[PDB]
């Protein structure tokens, strides 16, 4: 079963053995599988003995509160189990303010709204190229053919890196979250650093207007950013916008493929696309990381112990029936779409603006060229669960005669 012995300070009545890496009824959909944590018989805050043992906040109120309170809930160990969150070094994911603030401001210079607005049409040009290449085929595995190539190519654009480096960079990042065995996490991480360091050092001396140049020439605490800090920052800027976007776009397209009326709504009402993007972000939320207790702390009537890890599923806030009525229903016209899909608090996703642009551009450009599409006949879509939950594959089909080259 792989259950760790219940710590003495944890009450038995709060035990609920949820496995974030293999939840029951995953076949019903990953968001639905996690939603079991919100059924009436489950407390607001529970302890699971799976994956080493850890707390799980199941309601939006608690999830938000914990993310706001970095003093008690530290990012030093954000992953479960502990012997993975202690190893990882990317900046500034494992830092708490004030330390985190300096690096966060610098990162915002490369992915902030001003930059996203400026690269807006370049992202569109990339989406159109990928979609046009698939259009005549009448079929594709959305995840492999569009979802994966899109974000990585956008990173190359952002970081001013050559297209020829994509296959290798993609492989290195793939090994960090989906290893085939050729490389350990440390080896993949170091391989990434071996690639980034030379570029960082060269652009420190002869800078451009790209993301790496900006980070390399950044300042931290009155002095210049070190090579170690720069590579760790660039590393997160790379990995942060890959799996999240790949899987999110896949969840969204899976829904649209199965929902003809929703596709038509966006075709007839293009102005609703941004709102649709927000509603999809709520319904198909997919991240679930955590924090570690800095000291003994009583939280909502529960005794938390220093060193205890707590999973705070960003995914769950928007699915909470206390926040949004009929949470499993996708309604593009909701007046108030509440969610913490991009996180909450000091670590709120720095790439949130880039992500929304990628989503909106994908939706508009795909529906413009391929308005009518469906899940391939006989195909059964499978999901996966973890820190970033997702879709294994998404075989889509369409009649080329119903499409149009634009
Ligand atoms: C290669 C790899 C990774 C890996 C992880 C990684 C993490 C995650 C921590 C390290 C991952 C780091 C991600 C880096 C990228 C990144 O930072 N993205 C960012 C970005 C996007 C979101 C949001 C924020 C911005 C923060 C972050 C996430 C957590 C657990 N394990 Ru699992 N694991 C971990 C350590 C030691 C052994 C081990 C095993 C052993 C056997 C079988 C499984 N595992 N493992 C794998 C699949 C399913 C279950 C599973 C378990 C289950 C229980 C116990 C161990 N293992 N494992 C294995 C290989
Ligand atoms: C749909 C897509 C995305 C989702 C759902 C998502 C979600 C998240 C979440 C939940 C966090 C905070 C985690 C925590 O509090 O520990 C986060 C952090 C971050 N994300 Fe994203 N993200 C997305 C896209 C992107 C993109 C496109 C980039 C581009 C580089 C990116 C860069 C980052 C960075 C650098 C951080 C760290 C912020 C900090 O620690 O201060 N993300 N993201």
Query: Minimal CA–CA distance to 97: which of 70, 77, 79?
Result: 70
Continuous segment of H or E residues that includes residue 303: strand 302-304
Residue indicated by tokens 């969610």: 339
Structure tokens at 287: 């991240």
Protein residue with its CA nearest to atom 31 in ligand 1: 84
Tally of CA atoms within 13 A in the half-sphere of 49 that contains its CB: 16
Distance 177 CA to ligand 1 centre (A): 7
Which residues carry a binding-site annotation for heme? 349
For a mutational test of ligand 1's pocket, the pick from 1, 18, 20, 21, i.e. the residue with the most ligand atoms closer than 8 A to its C-beta, is 21
Q: What is the CATH number of the domain that holds 213?
A: 1.10.630.10
- Best CA proximity match to 143, nearest among 406, 404, 378, 375: 375
Give the CA dihedral 79, 80, 86, 90, nearest 10 degrees: -20
DSSP states along 206-229: S--SSHHHHHHT-EETTEEPPHHH
Note whether 14 and 43 are within 8 A (CB). Answer: yes
Angle ∠(41,44,47) on CA atoms, nearest 5? 90
* CB distance 158 to 211 below 8 Å: yes
- Positive or negative, the Cα torsion across 279, 282, 284, 285? positive
Going by C-beta distance under 8 Å and a sequence separation of 6 or more, which residues neighbour residue 84? none
Residue 304: half-sphere exposure toward Cβ, Cα within 13 Å: 25
- Three-state secondary-structure class, residue 384: strand
Cα separation of 131 and 364, whole Å?
A: 11
- Nearest in space to 376 (alpha carbons), one of 25, 137, 128: 137
Catalytic position from the list 96, 243, 308, 320: 243
Between the CA of 113 and the centroid of ligand 2 the distance, in Å, is 14
The boundaries of the domain holding residue 301 are 1-406
- Residue 221: left if φ>0, alpha if ψ -120 to 50, beta else—which one? left
Q: In units of Å, what resolution does this entry have?
A: 1.5
Q: Dihedral sign, CA of 344, 348, 349, 352?
A: positive
Q: Which of 130, 172, 350, 354 is catalytic?
A: 350
Q: Which of 361, 322, 366, 320 is nearest to 341 (CA)?
A: 320
Residue 50: active-site member? no
Determine the distance separating the centroid of ligand 2 and the alpha carbon of 244, expressed in angstroms: 8
Assess whether 256 carries a catalytic annotation.
Answer: no
Using the structure block, give the residue that is written with the tokens 């000291």. 295
Place of tokens 């996690």: 34
Terminal-residue alpha carbon distance, the chain: 54
Domains: count for the chain: 1
* CA dist., res. 103 & res. 398, Å (int): 45
Nearest residue by C-alpha to atom 59 in ligand 1: 179
Does an H or E element contain 283, and which? Answer: helix 273-283
% helix / strand / coil in the chain, to the nearest 5?
A: 50, 10, 40
What is d(CA 15, CA 283) in angstroms, rounded to the nearest whole number? 27
Phi then psi for 374, rounded to 5 degrees? -145, 170
Residue ID of nearest Cα to ligand 2 atom 1: 245
Give the whole-angstrom CA distance, residue 346 versus residue 340.
Answer: 13
- The minimum-distance atom of ligand 2 relative to the CA of 92 is 40
Method underlying the structure: X-ray
Closest CA to 334 of 283, 377, 384, 400: 283
Task: Give the closest ligand to the alpha carbon of residue 386.
Answer: 1
Instruction: At 119, list the tokens.
Output: 């690269």
């Amino acid at each position: 079963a792989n259950l760790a012995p219940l710590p003495p300070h944890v009450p038995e009545h709060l035990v609920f053995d949820f496995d974030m890496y293999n939840p029951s009824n995953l076949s019903a959909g990953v968001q639905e599988a996690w939603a079991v944590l919100q059924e009436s018989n489950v407390p607001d805050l529970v302890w699971t003995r799976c994956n080493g043992g850890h707390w799980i906040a199941t309601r939006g109120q608690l999830i938000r509160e914990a993310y706001e309170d970095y003093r008690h809930f530290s990012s030093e160990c954000p992953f479960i189990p502990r012997e993975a969150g202690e190893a990882y070094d990317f900046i500034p994911t494992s830092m708490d303010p004030p330390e985190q603030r300096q690096f966060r401001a610098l990162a915002n210079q490369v992915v902030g709204m001003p930059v996203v607005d400026k690269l807006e049409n370049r992202i569109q040009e990339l989406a159109c190229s990928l979609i046009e290449s698939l259009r005549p085929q009448g079929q594709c595995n959305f995840t492999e053919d569009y979802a994966e190539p899109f974000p990585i190519r956008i990173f190359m654009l952002l970081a001013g890196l050559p297209e020829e480096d994509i296959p290798h960079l993609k492989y290195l990042t793939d090994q960090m979250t989906r290893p085939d065995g050729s490389m350990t996490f440390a080896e993949a991480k170091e391989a990434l650093y071996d690639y980034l360091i030379p570029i960082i050092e060269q652009r420190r001396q002869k800078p451009g207007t790209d993301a790496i140049s900006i980070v390399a020439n950044g300042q931290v605490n009155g002095r210049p950013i070190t090579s170690d800090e720069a590579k760790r920052m660039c590393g997160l800027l790379l990995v942060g916008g890959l799996d999240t976007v790949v899987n999110f776009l896949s969840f969204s397209m899976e829904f649209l493929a199965k929902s003809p009326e929703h596709r038509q709504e966006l075709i007839e009402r293009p102005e609703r696309i941004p709102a649709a993007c927000e509603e999809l972000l709520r319904r198909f939320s997919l991240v679930a990381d955590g924090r570690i207790l800095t000291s003994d702390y009583e939280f909502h009537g529960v005794q938390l112990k220093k060193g205890d890890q707590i999973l705070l599923p960003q995914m769950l806030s928007g699915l909470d029936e206390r926040e949004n009525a009929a949470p499993m229903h996708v309604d593009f016209s909701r007046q108030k779409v509440s969610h913490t899909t991009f996180g909450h608090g000091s670590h709120l996703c720095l790439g949130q603006h880039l992500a929304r642009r990628e989503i909106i551009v994908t939706l508009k450009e795909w529906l413009t060229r391929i308005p009518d599409f469906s899940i391939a006949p006989g195909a059964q879509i499978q999901h996966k669960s973890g820190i970033v939950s997702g879709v294994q594959a998404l075989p889509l089909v369409w009649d080329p005669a119903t499409t149009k080259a634009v």
